[PDB]
Amino acid sequence: SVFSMFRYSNWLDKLYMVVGTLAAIIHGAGLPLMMLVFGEMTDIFAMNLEEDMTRYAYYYSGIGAGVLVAAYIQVSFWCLAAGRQIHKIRKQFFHAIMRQEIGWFDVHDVGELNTRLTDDVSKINEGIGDKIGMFFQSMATFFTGFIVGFTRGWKLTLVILAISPVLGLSAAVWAKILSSFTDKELLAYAKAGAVAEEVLAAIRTVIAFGGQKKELERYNKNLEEAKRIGIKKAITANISIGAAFLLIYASYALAFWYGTTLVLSGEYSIGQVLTVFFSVLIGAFSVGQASPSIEAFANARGAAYEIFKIIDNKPSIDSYSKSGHKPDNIKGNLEFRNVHFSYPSRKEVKILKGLNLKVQSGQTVALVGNSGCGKSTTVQLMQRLYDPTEGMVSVDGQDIRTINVRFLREIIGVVSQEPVLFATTIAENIRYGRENVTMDEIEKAVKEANAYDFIMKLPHKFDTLVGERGAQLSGGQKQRIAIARALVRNPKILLLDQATSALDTESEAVVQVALDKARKGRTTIVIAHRLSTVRNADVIAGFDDGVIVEKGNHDELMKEKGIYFKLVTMQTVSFWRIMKLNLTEWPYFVVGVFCAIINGGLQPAFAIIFSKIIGVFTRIDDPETKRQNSNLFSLLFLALGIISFITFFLQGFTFGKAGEILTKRLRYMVFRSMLRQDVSWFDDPKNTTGALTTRLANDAAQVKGAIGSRLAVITQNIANLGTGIIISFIYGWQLTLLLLAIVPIIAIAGVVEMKMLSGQALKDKKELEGSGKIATEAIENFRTVVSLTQEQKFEHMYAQSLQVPYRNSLRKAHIFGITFSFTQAMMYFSYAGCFRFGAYLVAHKLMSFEDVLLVFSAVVFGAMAVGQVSSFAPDYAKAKISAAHIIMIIEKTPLIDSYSTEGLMPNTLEGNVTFGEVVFNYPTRPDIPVLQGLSLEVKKGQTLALVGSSGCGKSTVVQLLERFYDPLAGKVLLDGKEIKRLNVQWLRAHLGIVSQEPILFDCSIAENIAYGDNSRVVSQEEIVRAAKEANIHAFIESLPNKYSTKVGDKGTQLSGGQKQRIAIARALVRQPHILLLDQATSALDTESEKVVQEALDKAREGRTCIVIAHRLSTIQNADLIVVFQNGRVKEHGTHQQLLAQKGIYFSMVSVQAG
Ligand SMILES: Nc1ncnc2c1ncn2[C@@H]1O[C@H](COP(=O)(O)OP(=O)(O)OP(=O)(O)O)[C@@H](O)[C@H]1O
Ligand SMILES: Nc1ncnc2c1ncn2[C@@H]1O[C@H](COP(=O)(O)OP(=O)(O)OP(=O)(O)O)[C@@H](O)[C@H]1O
Ligand SMILES: [Mg+2]
Ligand SMILES: [Mg+2]
């Protein structure tokens, strides 16, 4: 556990840290070393000045040169050691996640990882960089003060030193606590990031059903628990400083008393105590500078727990292992024998209860059965995503468990049940099948898949960017690309899973010929619910209760009159705006700023205290009195001590609490603003689920660190150094002019520092969203990328996007290092200058050296406080850009608004939809005319069927009615009223849709069905009443935990039919006036298809419907049918009228002639 964050440090990284620490000790001694020349001048106080002062000044000019080197070496080296290690952490951690199996993805929540990559790693960067360097600068200063003490003092040093262990232990006690709190706070943010990743993926269903309020308030809760842990961390860290500062001034008071005995004993002089106090007191302020460094390291330690926990884990069925067995001449042989298997998520249920099969080379197997018998499990087992409990899957004699994984997976082509594509060009989607592929092969492969014509018709033919998960293309076209992708591979075993579900009759027909032409050499297994495709296969198989019962040729199974016979028979500007948002918390700043000046301004004042204390010690010549008045001063240190406890704690608590209220305020509004946006906004190439969720975590975290507790210290350092120059202006004279004249040189260096950094961060921020895009793309589609065997390519792609920040991180160190060293060094020369200037003025008798020595002593305490403000600049530069983007997104307003109350909400509705002369284009592709002036009539109590070939604008009508996009020209009238003129939500409350490819949320089944109806308490009796009509009651009832079983991410646990049937239920909870079915019975059984139709037909009257489907048996029943053609509605009417006038409809139905 201990020091497990520095695992990937090279010999050159080691060299940086060792050389940095040695320089850090040398740099820290210089401020303690300045007091040595003062002590000898006090000894002289019991001709001189011009010879003595120049010697002491001459030393300061040399020190400044030593600081300019050491400071650069100190700061620069750690920053390099951080940047290189962080680069290796991100690359290793991502590689570790891809090494996992599917069962691990099934159990744990994958949505948490995306925020663990960007935010949680960035916390470590702050911990193990410059703060480690400064920590040693502080610690050298602390000890080097005592090193003078041992020479100058025998007991006085020991008396102060002996109360170091409390400071030493206290730091360990508070750190170990707040280190534990960090793990729990980060876990709260991870739970929030999962909600954002889920919602932004399925935004269309969220907009459709209109559940923005519920998802917003749920997202809010996770932030509430994060705030409560945050405020606890603030209280703890600020108390750590108060007690430490209290104990030092308390111990200083104890040290004074024994100092009073010098007159009685005669052990040492008053010249000694001034040396001892001036030596030892400097280190007191160094502790306050060290308090942030320990707090950073403790949080950075707390950040590491969960990252290395994933890296330390080892897989079961490893893909990266090269110790497997790989044969040469793989003849086609597949054997199942007595195979039992159950998933990890529900171990109680038994799906496969002993089956067996033999498939020789040159055989196309058909698997038939009802939804739930486990056809997809068999296909998913072949790839070896899960292993069997008993039974052996042997290939060509040898068992799968003995042979190699990667070698096995690169000879199996798989078209999954519901395909998914990656957001790139069409060429790259085809290229994921195999690396070294030529254009000629792709040309041939597409033409076999029958997806050539539409690719030729689109501009940028092979360079058209498909959306996230292939959303921009149609349902049919998307499926063909998956078919091509398998055929480019050219494997031995081909595995089709309902490959011709969304495709029409003509596309199925020609694709069948291409597959059947080049079948002889291959081995094939085909899943299908159409039976015409099943007719010409070699062997058919029937599942039943886990076991495969029936087998054989078409003739035999017909004569045997089993399940197959029944199936065949049945078919027949930053501070001004950002500060203003937190107008409420005004009394926190008033107390915080007031307290910072009082506790900050005490440190330069010591010289005034020490001068008066020294003066009162030698005021009156009489000795007995000195005993009494000296005792009171010791009480004064305790009094300041007890107040110091009150000031520092309150200062830190007031500022610390203020930030945590704002942090949550920033997040809540941005997520609320993003959820208002139009669909057109989500279709932009720049906007993506991964790109957005990264934008949430990064922007808030950048703002939080700059203006939180860290703001407070700067206020203390400004007041300190202000008080320093004020008392220099008051008591001193002709010094401020020489001191202040060097300040513009720091100012010129400061402006060029921020200008170089602030310009750099904008280019860095833009790239990191590009980095985030790939992770969310790879993680969400894990089954695709595992099946395709493309684990390296994504790591290589991920390595590119990280390379541009990596350069900036290295460059940043040198810019930051040069400014620090210069800003630090220019002060020392000023401390040389003032003494040398004092050498001239004292001689001529215009300035009093006794008073000059005090201002010299007073000004030099700020030297460290000057160094604190120098380290602030980068944080301000990153916040400036981060803030601008937040105000940009919040202030933006959409075209069609969901939160606007205005519109017309008519008390009743007749339910008559009309379309007339409608032209429309999508925003992403402006030139292509999808609809070219169509018209359509829909009245109450009627079902209108829409038909045509794949990609003739059927699903566009559904989307146009739901107000995702508005028409360019034309008109839509609801009951003789413009849909633009109506209220937005009001419309979406009445009508309800069933999408082409359903999506579900990570929740219980009851809540997914209850999600359909919002703004009302859904009764359970109605849920079961609906789910009885939907026809999934017996399935849910047989399952353990009833409705409380948690469905997976995007409906991954349940089978297609099971979720698709839920989607049907979710629609029927509302009892809508207008209804829209877009291939609602795509993948369902013949037994189900009737029972689903019965409920619709029995309760058809009253409401209105528009059906889209390829099954002519459904369209047979409908009132009037409509046929599309290149945008124009060519054919329309009733079944007898359309069949009489023998056009395309006759050609469409006659293709099924006997
Ligand atoms: N990853 C999984 N985790 C848990 N249970 C699963 C998983 N995949 C499938 N199941 C369950 O196993 C059973 C069989 O599912 P499977 O999809 O293999 O059957 P199917 O006949 O192919 O379904 P369909 O006909 O709808 O395509 C179902 O009851 C389903 O809920
Ligand atoms: N958001 C979008 N951006 C760009 N083009 C789109 C978008 N949505 C649809 N299209 C294009 O419009 C054409 C037809 O659209 P649509 O998918 O509605 O037809 P469809 O009848 O639903 O097709 P299918 O029957 O194959 O599902 C397709 O070629 C598709 O690429
Ligand atoms: Mg299936
Ligand atoms: Mg469609």
The full DSSP string for 735-773 is SHHHHHTTHHHHHHHHHHHHHHHHHHHHHHHHHHHHHHH
Cα of 475 vs centre of ligand 4, distance in Å, is: 5
The CA distances from residue 1059 to 329, 375, 774, in Å, are 42, 16, 28
569: buried, middle or exposed (CB in 10 Å: 19+, 13-18, 0-12)? Answer: exposed
What's this structure's resolution in Å?
A: 3.4
Coil vs helix vs strand at 529: coil
Q: How many CA atoms lie within 13 A of 405 on its CB side?
A: 20
Cα of 1055 vs centre of ligand 3, distance in Å, is: 6
Nearest CA to ligand 1 atom 13: 372
CB 909 within 8 A of CB 1073: yes
> Phi, psi at residue 200, to the nearest 5°?
-70, -20
Cα of 106 vs centre of ligand 2, distance in Å, is: 32
Q: Distance between CA 259 and CA 637 in Å, rounded?
A: 14
> Phi, psi at residue 1108, to the nearest 5°?
-125, 120
β-pairing, 1104-1108 vs 943-947, is parallel
Is 882 labeled as ligand-binding? no
Neighbours of 329 (CB within 10 A): 5
Cα of 469 vs centre of ligand 2, distance in Å, is: 14
Nearest to 496 by CA among 375, 369, 334, 356: 375
81 Cβ contact list (under 8 Å, min separation 6): 9, 13, 16, 17, 20, 128, 129
Which of 461, 956, 957, 959 should be mutated for ligand 2, with most atoms under 8 A from CB? 956
Cα of 1053 vs centre of ligand 1, distance in Å, is: 7
Nearest CA to ligand 2 atom 3: 472
Q: Which amino acid is at 1126?
A: N
Q: Which amino acid is at 143?
A: F
Angle 270-303/164-201 helices, nearest 10 degrees?
Answer: 30
- 781 membership: H or E segment, kind and range: none
Neighbours of 486 (CB within 10 A): 21
- HEC string of 304-354 equals CHHHHHHHHCCCCCCCCCCCCECCCCCCCEEEEECCEECCCCCCCCCCEEC
- 525 membership: H or E segment, kind and range: strand 523-527
555: buried, middle or exposed (CB in 10 Å: 19+, 13-18, 0-12)? Answer: exposed
Structure-determination technique: cryo-EM
Q: Strands across the sheet with 398-399, in order?
A: 356-360, 333-337, 394-395, 398-399
CB 1050 within 8 A of CB 201: yes
Neighbours of 444 (CB within 10 A): 14
- HEC string of 30-71 equals HHHHCCHHHHHHHHHCCCHHHHHHHHHHHHHHHHHHHHHHHH
CB 155 within 8 A of CB 258: yes
Q: Which ligand is nearest to the CA of 949?
A: 2
Query: What is the set of domains in the chain, with CATH numbers?
Result: 11-314+577-891 (1.20.1560.10), 362-376+407-571 (3.40.50.300)
Two tokens, residue 807: 């350069």
Cβ of residue 351 lying under 6 Å from some atom of ligand 1: yes
Distance between alpha carbon 292 and the CA centroid of its chain, in Å?
26
Q: Distance between CA 478 and CA 428 in Å, rounded?
A: 14
Nearest CA to ligand 2 atom 1: 472
Q: Distance between CA 119 and CA 706 in Å, rounded?
A: 15
Q: Distance between CA 300 and CA 78 in Å, rounded?
A: 15
Nearest CA to ligand 1 atom 29: 372
Angle 803-844/743-780 helices, nearest 10 degrees?
Answer: 160
For residue 975, is it left (φ>0), alpha (ψ between -120 and 50) or beta? Answer: left
Angle 602-617/586-600 helices, nearest 10 degrees?
Answer: 30
813 Cβ contact list (under 8 Å, min separation 6): 75, 76, 79, 80, 83
- HEC string of 1041-1106 equals CHHHCECCCCCCCCCHHHHHHHHHHHHHCCCCCEEEEECCCCCCCHHHHHHHHHHHHHCCCCCEEE
Cβ of residue 473 lying under 6 Å from some atom of ligand 2: yes
The terminus-to-terminus CA distance of the chain in angstroms comes to 74
Cβ of residue 371 lying under 6 Å from some atom of ligand 1: yes
Cα of 425 vs centre of ligand 3, distance in Å, is: 29
Two tokens, residue 462: 């092979």
Q: Which ligand is nearest to the CA of 996?
A: 4
Q: Distance between CA 925 and CA 586 in Å, rounded?
A: 51
Q: Which ligand is nearest to the CA of 378?
A: 1
Which of 207, 930, 1108 should be mutated for ligand 2, with most atoms under 8 A from CB? 930
Nearest to 120 by CA among 194, 186, 27, 176: 186
Is 952 labeled as ligand-binding? yes
